[PDB]
Amino acid sequence: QRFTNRTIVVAGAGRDIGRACAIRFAQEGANVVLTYNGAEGAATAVAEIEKLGRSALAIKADLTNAAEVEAAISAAADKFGEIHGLVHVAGGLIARKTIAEMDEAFWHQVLDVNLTSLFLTAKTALPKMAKGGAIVTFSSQAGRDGGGPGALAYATSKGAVMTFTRGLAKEVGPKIRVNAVCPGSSEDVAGLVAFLASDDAAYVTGACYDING
Amino acid sequence: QRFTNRTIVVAGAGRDIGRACAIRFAQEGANVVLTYNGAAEGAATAVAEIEKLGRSALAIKADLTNAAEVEAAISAAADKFGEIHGLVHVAGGLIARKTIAEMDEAFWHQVLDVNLTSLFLTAKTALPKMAKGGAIVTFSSQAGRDGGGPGALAYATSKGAVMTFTRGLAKEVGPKIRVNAVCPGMISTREGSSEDVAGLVAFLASDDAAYVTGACYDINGGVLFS
Amino acid sequence: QRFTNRTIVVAGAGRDIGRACAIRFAQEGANVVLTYNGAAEGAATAVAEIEKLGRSALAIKADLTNAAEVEAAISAAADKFGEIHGLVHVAGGLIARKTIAEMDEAFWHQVLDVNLTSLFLTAKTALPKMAKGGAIVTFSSQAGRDGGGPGALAYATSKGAVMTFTRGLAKEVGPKIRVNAVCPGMISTTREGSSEDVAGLVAFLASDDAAYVTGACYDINGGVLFS
Amino acid sequence: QRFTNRTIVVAGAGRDIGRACAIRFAQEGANVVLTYNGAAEGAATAVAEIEKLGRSALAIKADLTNAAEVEAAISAAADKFGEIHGLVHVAGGLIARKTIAEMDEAFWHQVLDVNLTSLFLTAKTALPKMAKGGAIVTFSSQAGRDGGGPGALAYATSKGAVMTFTRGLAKEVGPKIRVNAVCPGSSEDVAGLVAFLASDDAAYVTGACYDING
């Protein structure tokens, strides 16, 4: 009952980790808004969540698109009211390329899906979030060490996401907490995320919580 | 004598720190190429100070967020002096202090492009022209580690990105090239200035740092107000 | 119910944080063993409060820098409750604020022994008695990252040592045992959580939801002593 | 000329990195005190190379875990050369690889005393005899950051402590005295980094860890 009568937006909830987060919050009593760009994973989950007695909404959204992010956030707020949690799962390697292979468009595609998207969701969600609310971002070991062969653009965006998370923490607290998970199965990851989004972590903000999974 | 017959490209001498680095390297015997954008009065000072040492800098106007102007500057440098031994990327800056509510998406990209994307373009363009054992020095910030001060969220984020980019690029382009970052703090309205940051940059570009790569070197003080 | 029939050893309940952890694990169904040293008036509160839950803590006197008292405390716990599922090591502290010129070698060792050597001893001793999937939680500190405040150099140093010990030990004892650290700040005397909240982070790290966390340092703002 | 008429103590200077440090410093004009606790060959070799350069050096046998020997070594430095400008604490070591079940309390103490207690002793002792503008340089390690490889638990722990100690001391003794770590390509390369941190080139660098692949 950690998320009783609470509304959680999981941004990028279509597969794997985001999907597992969506369900875990429902298992703990939350209304859950799922976003996706890519629909089966999300629909399923919506059904799983309804089967639990709980409420959910699935919304198509390209998270690099300021307008579709506004539309998604607004639907969530209009349906359930105050947002208690934003979990921003979207991101990805895209592909492996050395710098000689990357063109400017590819660089921006990676930075946009991992980093710009988070700027958009956090920016849009914040004015709607409940006092005591919380944001959880996803960083990566690649952000700390520079990443493996061909993953330069993705590593860079994750390091950015780590710095952004600490900076936003200071900017929006005490009202709103902001923490990163640095990723064991999808549901293990979701246990950690649910901890960070819960009042169990009322005094945790600006931090990176690592998990083998 | 540290840089006698070495070609050093200082990208971002539109900033005071590039003025300081450009003069430092020339004082140490380097062939200096410096790019500039904006009013670039700091660049004009570097050029006139460099002439006073009896050599001459190749100074080139280039908005380093523009891939074409980045390629021109790199080509002209290669044309004039041959192999690039050092690229020092100092472009970037705070642009303005704004909370996330005050920032719009075009403000976000302006900060990230000037601080981070410019770094991608210039390293990407310079790399094929660089000498064996050449060094890149990037500009990070203690803000990159801790999230920065009030209103500096976009800037801090780009300074964290540069730190990670530096570690990745280092693994990718070594052993031929080294890549490292300076991590200054800020000047409050024992702190060193751009003249002292320039000293650490010169160190990282020198033969004494031949085996330093993928590192962020801290220094107290800095290039802008906190 | 998170710790129902779990055996949790809180080593260092001579300190307020050990009072807070012991009561918290007891609230969540654990069999609690707590060791104590000094006036231990905090350990005495934990024991009385635990009794009021209708169970009974095993409280054991032990100076955790003394290998023999560590072995006894550990045996006594294994003898009473069987396999140890959780070792929470909270012994340590500042002792006194002294500059390097004011410290003597014996002072240096006193701080390092109570904070670090005690951890080596209790982890070394407990390991063979621990269950598969058991968790160790160690006590680091933000001062371990940044070098600490005025006069706290011996303490801070021991807290960075604890952080590195936590990472090496995790690589050595996994996958059977997890090892992690909490990393609090400090209470200013001028949103800071207290020992009750740090205890909540410890409980998490000892729990089933943290099965795939190991080798990590988990920060929390606020803490167990005055800055 | 970076160390012209400056006195540097290199604690642990009989082999590899300390020996290279002691030499490098001489090459830039320093008076150099070398401590060693091993066979005295490497440290006398070095003393000889240094006099070849026309500079003064002094080797001293010292167990740096021994408070009395450290006091006598510092004291002899002072008598001979005057104010100390730089302490470079190179002493440290794995000693051996043992899992925690294999370590006894005496082994644990031995590793922490060689890597960590020695540094407490040498910094504590030198400090009151250091010149304004002086500098300490310690040796951390990637093991301090990541916990070390198999059997190296005690060594890694001592290294993490050395890193924290470096940052804490830097705040305690500045601005008068700077304190930094090298996190270690050959011994001469390492020595060039050390020399930089010990020099006025690093006047604004304190409380830091500088990495080198070496």
User: D105: distance to nearest CA of chain B, Å?
Assistant: 37
Where would I find the H helices in chain C? 16-27, 41-51, 67-81, 105-112, 118-126, 142-146, 153-173, 195-206
Neighbours of chain D (3+ CB pairs under 8 A): B, C
- Taking CA atoms, what residue in D is nearest to B193? D204
Structure tokens, C58: 């095993």
Contact A91, A66 (CB under 8 A): no
**Distance between the two ends of chain B, CA-based, in angstroms?**
36
Inter-chain touch D205–B218, beta carbons under 8 Å: yes
Q: Is D135 exposed, middle or buried (0-12, 13-18, 19+ CB in 10 A)?
A: buried
Per the annotation, the verdict on A154 as an active-site residue is: yes
Determine contact: D192 vs chain B, CB below 8 A. Answer: yes
CA distances from C66 to B211, C33, C119, D154 (A): 46, 18, 11, 19
Please list the active-site residues of D.
155
Contact B15, B91 (CB under 8 A): yes
Q: Among residues B10, B119, B136, which one has the least CA distance to residue B64?
A: B119
- Cα B48 off chain centre by: 20
* Calpha distance A64→A116 (Å, rounded): 6
Determine contact: B185 vs chain D, CB below 8 A. Answer: no
Determine contact: D64 vs chain C, CB below 8 A. Answer: no
Look up tokens 């925690």; give the residue.
Answer: D100
Write out the DSSP string of D157-173.
HHHHHHHHHHHHHHHHH
- Cα A140 off chain centre by: 13
Inter-chain touch B211–D185, beta carbons under 8 Å: yes
* Calpha distance B46→B51 (Å, rounded): 9
Contact A99, A66 (CB under 8 A): no
- Cα D169 off chain centre by: 15
Look up tokens 């990282």; give the residue.
Answer: B204
Which helix (H) or strand (E) covers residue C8, if one does? strand C7-11
Inter-chain touch D204–B211, beta carbons under 8 Å: no
The count of domains in chain C is 1
Using only C-alpha atoms, chain C has a radius of gyration, in whole angstroms, of 16
Q: Among residues A69, A74, A180, which one has the least CA distance to residue A117?
A: A69
Range of the domain at C122: 1-227
Task: Give the domain CATH number at B114.
Answer: 3.40.50.720
Write out the DSSP string of B183-203.
EE--B----B-HHHHHHHHHH
Region label for A189, one of left (φ > 0), alpha (ψ between -120 and 50) or beta (otherwise): alpha
Beta bridge partners of D9: D33, D87
* Calpha distance B172→B170 (Å, rounded): 5
* Calpha distance C42→B179 (Å, rounded): 54
Residues of D in contact with B219 (CB under 8 A): 204-205, 208
> Which of B36, B155, B211, B217 does the annotation list as catalytic?
B155
Q: Among residues D90, D92, D85, which one has the least CA distance to residue D17?
A: D90
Residues of B in contact with D196 (CB under 8 A): 203, 208
Inter-chain touch A168–B100, beta carbons under 8 Å: yes
- Name the D residues in 67-106 with CB < 8 Å from any B CB: none
Residue D175 has its nearest CB partner, among B190, B203, B210, at B190
SS3 D176: coil
Buried b (16+ CB within 10 A) or exposed e, C5-20: ebbbbbbbbbbbbbbb
Instruction: Mention every residue, 6+ apart, whose C-beta is less than 8 A from residue B211.
Output: D185, D189, D212, D213, D214
Determine contact: D119 vs chain C, CB below 8 A. Answer: no
C-alpha dihedral, D115 to D116 to D117 to D122, nearest 10°: 80
**Cα angle value A20/A24/A25 (rounded, 5°):** 120
Determine contact: A191 vs chain C, CB below 8 A. Answer: yes
Using only C-alpha atoms, chain B has a radius of gyration, in whole angstroms, of 16
Count contacts between A and B (CB, < 8 Å): 123
- State which approach was used to obtain the coordinates: X-ray
Write out the DSSP string of C104-167.
-HHHHHHHHIIIIIHHHHHHHHHGGGEEEEEEEEEE--HHHHH--STT-HHHHHHHHHHHHHHH
Contact B116, B158 (CB under 8 A): yes
